[PDB]
Amino acid sequence: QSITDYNYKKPLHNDYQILDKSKIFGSNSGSFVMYSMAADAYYIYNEKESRKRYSPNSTYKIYLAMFGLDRHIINDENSRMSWNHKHYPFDAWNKEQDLNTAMQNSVNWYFERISDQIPKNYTATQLKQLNYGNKNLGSYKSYWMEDSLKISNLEQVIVFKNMMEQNNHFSKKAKNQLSSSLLIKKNEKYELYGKTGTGIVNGKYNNGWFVGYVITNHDKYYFATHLSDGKPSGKNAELISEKILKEMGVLN
Numbered sequence: 001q002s003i004t005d006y007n008y009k010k011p012l013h014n015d016y017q018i019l020d021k022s023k024i025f026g027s028n029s030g031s032f033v034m035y036s037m038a039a040d041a042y043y044i045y046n047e048k049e050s051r052k053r054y055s056p057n058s059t060y061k062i063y064l065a066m067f068g069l070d071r072h073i074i075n076d077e078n079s080r081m082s083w084n085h086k087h088y089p090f091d092a093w094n095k096e097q098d099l100n101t102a103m104q105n106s107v108n109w110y111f112e113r114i115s116d117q118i119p120k121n122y123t124a125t126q127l128k129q130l131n132y133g134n135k136n137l138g139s140y141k142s143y144w145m146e147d148s149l150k151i152s153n154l155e156q157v158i159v160f161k162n163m164m165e166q167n168n169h170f171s172k173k174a175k176n177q178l179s180s181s182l183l184i185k186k187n188e189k190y191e192l193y194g195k196t197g198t199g200i201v202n203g204k205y206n207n208g209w210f211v212g213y214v215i216t217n218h219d220k221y222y223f224a225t226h227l228s229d230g231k232p233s234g235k236n237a238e239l240i241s242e243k244i245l246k247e248m249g250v251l252n
Helices: 057-070 099-105 108-116 120-130 153-165 172-182 234-248
Strands: 015-019 029-036 041-045 183-186 190-201 204-216 220-229
Touching: 029 153, 029 234, 041 153, 057 099, 057 108, 057 120, 057 153, 057 172, 057 190, 057 204, 099 172, 120 153, 153 204, 153 220, 172 183, 172 190, 190 234, 204 234, 220 234
Parallel strands: 015 041
Antiparallel strands: 029 041, 029 220, 183 190, 190 204, 204 220
16 A cells, blocks of 8 residues: 555564575465574575565464454353354355364454454554554455555564564463464474465465464474465465475474
8 A cells, every 4th residue: 555565674683594495386486484483593485575565364364363362252161153144155164163163264254253343443553563564454344355454474474473472461371272273283293383375366366375383392483485476375385384394394
């Protein structure tokens, strides 16, 4: 929307290391960013592209979930929502949901019902304190879905790490409940957490994301992949992320 709404220019006040992951990206274009807690360092593939801001799509469901927990729209005893009897093109959406099943299947209507109960001024205050991207709420409808709110790949990692790791006004039980909804994989070596995002413009993929974190036995890593062209789906951003983390030794 404005002059600064499409890019992130704040200098990194950290150690960073430039990566080359162009062979894993193949014919897709985009960026990859990772932060290590122990090193307090960032690791960036395609730094310029990583500072370009795009709609977060379904990765913003992370944040609506946190806001929903914070304002007690949902909680740990009950985060169930009944289906409002509208047919969707996948049967996983056509039933009752709780936070876990809604996050796993990316059920838009669950999160829209959360957003509807959230006053605009609280959201504005949260995006400001979080430094969430361009902070542009626009029409305040489904503003995170190919619309006014945009955020860069680098910011997705900075903002998620700071939400989760700083002692802020969000509680530890809300963070833990959000974590459970995001858990994808656990073995003896790691826990992998994350959320896909996929934008569709005129029947085509235009925006792919996978944003998450890994807990290993020595460290904890926040990461995000954005895909801007090629086949830029959430699913593809997830495959690329896991390929990349594997090579770096994060997944063993």
